Amino acid sequence: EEPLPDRAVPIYVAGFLALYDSLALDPDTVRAALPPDNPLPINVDHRAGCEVGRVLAVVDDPRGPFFVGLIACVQLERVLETAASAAIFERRGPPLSREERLLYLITNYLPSVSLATKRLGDRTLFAHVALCAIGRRLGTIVTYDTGLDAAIAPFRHLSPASREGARRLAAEAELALSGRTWAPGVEALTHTLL
Amino acid sequence: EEPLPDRAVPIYVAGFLALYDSLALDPDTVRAALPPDNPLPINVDHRAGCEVGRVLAVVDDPRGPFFVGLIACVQLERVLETAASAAIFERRGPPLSREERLLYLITNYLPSVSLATKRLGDRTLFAHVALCAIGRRLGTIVTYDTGLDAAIAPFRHLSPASREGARRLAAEAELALSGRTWAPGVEALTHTLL
C-alpha cells in the first residue's frame, strides 16, 4: 500500500498497572519487585512477538503501581489505520494530522493495558505490559499522548513524590532508547488485532 | 439473568458534533439550524429503535457545534456489561462501583458519536446524535461522566460564552426530562452492538 513513514510518531502511555485495596497485588509484594531487574517490554495482547514499546518507569504509589511507557512503531500506526478504514468514517471536520490521528486510533482501539506477572510460586515478578484490544481484554485505563509530561498530567490522584520519581526515571530511561523503533511486522500485528 | 436495577445511572455526554475548517458543515448553515425545532434524540449506531437518551443542548462555537446529552438506560448498562463479560477481564484492583463501571464500559465501547442531518436538498437540519460502536463507526470524540459540569470541563478549548450557554441550556432541558428513562430493549441493544 502507501509507503511506510520513515520515522515513528513517539507515543507515551501512562496509567496505574494495579490498584490497592482500600488482593493479588498488595503494596508489600509490589515493593519487593519495585525496581525491575530487566526492562519490561510493551506488547499487544500479551504476545511476545508483537512488541511495540518499552516501559520507561514503574513507581510505587499509595494508589498503586504507576507506570510510564514509550511506544515507537510505524507498523502499529499502519495497522490501526487499516482497522479504521474497515469502519464507517463519520467524523465531521477537517482531517486530523498524523499525530492526533494516531492518538485518536490507539486510544479507541487499545484503551486499556494489562500487567503480566510470573507465576505465583530487586525482583523479577513483573514481566511485561500488554496493550489490550477493546472487545478482547479489559485492563486498567491508560492515557496516550505525544508528550511525556502530557501523558502523566491527567492523573491528578498521583502523589507529587510518585509523579516526580516517574518523570525523572522515565527521562533517563527514554535516553537509553535513543532512536530505537519496534518492528513486530505488519501482518503479525494484523493477525493479533483484526 | 440478574435483576435489572430499578433506577438508571444518569450519564452525561459532551463533545463537538463537528469542527469548522480553519466543508460539509460551515458556520453559516450551523447557525441556520442553531436552535433545533424538535429535540434531538440519542441512539446507538443510527438505529431509531435504540434510543437511549436526549441531546440537552447544542451551542454554536468558533471551534464547531458543541453539544451536551443525557443518557438514562438501564438496559444499555446491562448490555455493555454482557459485552464486557465476553472479554477476558484482566483489570488489577478492587471492583469498580456501579457508576464507574458504567463509565469504564461506555467510554471504551462507545467512544465516539456521529451527528445525523437531513438530506442536502430555526431549522430542522439536525436529526439525531448516534453513539458509535468502536470497530463499527468512527465519529467525533466525546466524554462521559456522571455530572453535567464534569462532562463539559475537559473541553478547555470551548469559549467561555459557549460553555455558559451550554450549561444553562442543558440545565433547563434536563429539567423537562424529569424522571424519564429509555427502554429500547435488551435484545434490541444486543443485536445492534454484539
Resolution in A: 2.3
Q: How many CB atoms lie within 10 A of CB B191?
A: 13
Q: Are A112 and A132 in contact (CB under 8 A)?
A: yes
Q: Any CB–CB contact under 8 A between A95 and chain B? A: no
Experimental method: X-ray
And the C-alpha cell for B111? 467512544
d(CA B15, CA B155): 8
Amino acid B136 reads: R
Burial-class residue A118 by CB neighbours within 10 Å (0-12, 13-18, 19+): exposed
And the C-alpha cell for B49? 429503535
> What residue ranges define each of the domains in chain B, with the CATH number in brackets?
11-193 (3.20.16.10)
- Indicate the residue of B25, B108, B141 with minimum beta-carbon distance to A134: B108
- Chain A, nearest residue to B116 by Cα: A90
Determine whether the interchain pair B87/A24 forms a contact, defined as Cβ–Cβ distance below 8 Å: no
Q: How many CB atoms lie within 10 A of CB A34?
A: 15
Residue ranges with strand state E in B90-175: 112-117, 126-132, 137-138, 140-145
The three-class DSSP label of residue A107 is: helix
Q: How far is CA B105 from CA A16, A135, B11, B100, in A?
A: 17, 10, 12, 8
d(CA B109, CA B104): 9
> Which residues are CB-contacts of B118 (< 8 A; sequence separation ≥ 6)?
B124, B125, B127
- Indicate the residue of B84, B91, B140 with minimum beta-carbon distance to A93: B140
Q: How far is CA B35 from CA A119, B121, B123, B124, in A?
A: 60, 20, 7, 9
And the C-alpha cell for A152? 502523566
Please name which of B159, B162, B144, B191 lies closest in space to residue B50, comparing C-alpha atoms: B191
Long-range contacts, B30-34 (Cβ 8 Å, 24+): B30/B60, B30/B64, B30/B65, B31/B60, B32/B122, B32/B123, B32/B125, B33/B122, B33/B123, B33/B124, B33/B125, B33/B126, B34/B58, B34/B60, B34/B122, B34/B123
CA atoms A25, A28, A30, A32: torsion sign: negative
And the C-alpha cell for B143? 466524554
d(CA A141, CA A63): 14
Amino acid B168 reads: R
Using DSSP bridges, classify how beta strands B47-59 and B140-145 pair: parallel, antiparallel or unpaired.
unpaired
Using DSSP bridges, classify how beta strands B112-117 and B126-132 pair: parallel, antiparallel or unpaired.
antiparallel
